[PDB]
Amino acid sequence: MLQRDFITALPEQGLDHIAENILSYLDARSLCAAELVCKEWQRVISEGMLWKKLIERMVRTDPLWKGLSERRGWDQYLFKNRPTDGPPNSFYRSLYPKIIQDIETIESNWRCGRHNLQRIQCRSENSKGVYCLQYDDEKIISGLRDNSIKIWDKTSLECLKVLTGHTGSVLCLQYDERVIVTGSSDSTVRVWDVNTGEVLNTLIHHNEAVLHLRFSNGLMVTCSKDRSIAVWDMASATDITLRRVLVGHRAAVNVVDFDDKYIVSASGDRTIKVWSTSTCEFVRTLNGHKRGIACLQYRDRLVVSGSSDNTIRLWDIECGACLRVLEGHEELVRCIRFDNKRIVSGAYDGKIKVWDLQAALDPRAPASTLCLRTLVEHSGRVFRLQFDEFQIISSSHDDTILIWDFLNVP
């Protein structure tokens, strides 16, 4: 006997759960097929709660599914072991295609550039403009040319705090659960309590404007107009020691990123430089930009950079090869981020571009196909943006923060 109906045979053995485990591996399309094989298969899928289980597996893997679970509030039907109110299998079976529909209309919104736009006037004092920002579900924190940090309610767009202390423009910031960290034209880095807004530390070191910083896992890196990168052990907000100074660039170091392996610096001197995170020794230079580099992000093997030459470049950090040049911005590329699906760039002409990342990395793909959308709502240079599966938030010389919503569209 060369054939056995596993999904029937196991229940007949009293071993329903095993049959369920088998089906639990299937993707939606295959699971649908399995339902149609015969009544006993349908019965096992239905009573084994396989669609609830699948949706949970999508949420546990895909942050998009995670996101939607929260924003749509069908997360409240997931996990929680026992039924309780007991939404039946039929419900979760009905929901899966509605999530897929949801998802496709989101992608369509990005592609066709349908969005809800909300505009925060940061009502800056004399000096106008918003050089940096970071957000979460609850708030947007921003750094301004008037030397202030402003915190915005994410929902109401009200201003909740205004931190003052820097004697120059706030050029870069990053925050976590515990602190905000900022670099200013005044050459200081300041650590603030993310809640009380109390100054916890001030790093005196850079001789000139501090242009970028990043911290993670008890390590902080700063970089300055003084052409230096500083690497800090960051035990706590108050226990922050200078580990090494990397001097390397012939001009201002405008941006710095890193992970476990590599620190990545980019400069007005037209170079990206790679350094060992562990040894702080130089590794390799990534040259090719025809002009200064204003912005960069590093993740995995991929460095993406935006230049005064009006191009974006994609690099492999291991051989330092440029994989793709992206042309279309008519001015300097002043900020840039990416995830797995796309690149979002901002330029000095106040325009924001959205690029197919996977297409950019396919060397067969024409330039023709690479820019999905051009978003024109700023009336000044774009200094900073952050985005996720659902939105862009951008800040600008025009003294505005823009929320572009591709989920809650009208």
Binding site: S169, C172, L211, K225, A251, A252, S267, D269, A294, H397
Partner: peptide
Amino acid sequence: LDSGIHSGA
């Protein structure tokens, strides 16, 4: 204007 970046030209 733009204190956030510098070139070298």
